[PDB]
Design a protein around this ligand. Structure first.
Ligand SMILES: [Ca+2]
Length: 280
């Protein structure tokens, strides 16, 4: 069944290629055991070749198939990496095709949905410069995918968090907290809080970027999720040293946090107290 499809991916017949591609994608969309069967049949080197196709139909299916493969476990993400997917996927971030870019961004975010070793592979391939450029996009849909992918990069270890910092993502994220669009705020703050999960060097890079004045302002937000996410970043930068703890105190958070203690939503009531006790 599968060896016969993997073989057809080399076929000069575009109907044969597309039919097997459409079959492999639907078979890989399924279970994690199914993803392995597709891997083992050698579909991966064949799929990576197709990422270079000028044919949008065969490229769209190939991308779907790879993002569905990278939907699996940590060492199946590694197979996608070892096959050499990343450079082709990073190449596609310069695409004017909104659908191709959406698929390529999805696949990269799914590859970044694994362990630090996998997350580093994405960084190593050079995804971050392209990702940061996309935060300056006027497309709210492109912005979301780029912010999703970045948040997944910034989920990893300190080496991966500092990578995002060194990629100059923070000024862009800070500039995005001044957005009137509450849905952009949700995604920018989410990525920013992941940067804020790091060590003292990383906590300080966030502080130096002018993040605190925007976060302290957002603590008086009428959106329960944006207010919750501001707390997220603060309680995360509170984890850092007394030198950092002080910068937070002189941001004016102290009173806003003292007020938040008495909230209608008991979820942010504890999220504020945990931030307070880790500050003094
Ligand atoms: Ca074409």
């Amino acid at each position: 069944e599968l060896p016969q499809m993997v073989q057809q991916l080399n076929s000069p017949d575009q109907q044969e290629l597309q039919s097997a591609l459409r079959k492999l994608s639907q078979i890989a969309s399924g279970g994690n055991e199914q993803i392995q069967a597709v891997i083992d049949a050698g579909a991966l080197p064949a799929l990576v070749q197709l990422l270079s196709s000028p044919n949008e139909q065969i490229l769209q299916e190939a991308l779907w198939a790879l993002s569905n493969i990278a939907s699996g476990g940590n060492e199946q993400i590694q197979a996608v990496i070892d096959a050499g997917a990343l450079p082709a996927l990073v190449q596609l971030l310069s695409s004017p095709n909104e659908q191709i870019l959406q698929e390529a961004l999805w696949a990269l975010s799914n590859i970044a949905s694994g362990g630090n070793e996998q997350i580093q592979a994405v960084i190593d391939a050079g995804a971050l410069p392209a990702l940061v450029q996309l935060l300056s996009s006027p497309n709210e849909q492109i912005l979301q995918e780029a912010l999703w992918a970045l948040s997944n990069i910034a989920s990893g270890g300190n080496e991966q968090i500092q990578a995002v910092i060194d990629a100059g993502a923070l000024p862009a994220l800070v500039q995005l907290l001044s957005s009137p669009n509450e849905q952009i705020l949700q995604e920018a703050l989410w990525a920013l809080s992941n940067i804020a999960s790091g060590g003292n060097e990383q906590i300080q890079a966030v502080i130096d970027a002018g993040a605190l004045p925007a976060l302290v302002q957002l603590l008086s937000s009428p959106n329960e999720q944006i207010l919750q996410e501001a707390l997220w970043a603060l309680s995360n930068i509170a984890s850092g040293g007394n030198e950092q703890k002080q910068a937070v105190k002189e941001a004016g958070a102290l009173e806003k946090l003292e007020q938040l203690q008495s909230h209608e939503n008991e979820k942010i009531q504890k999220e504020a107290q945990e931030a307070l006790e880790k500050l003094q």
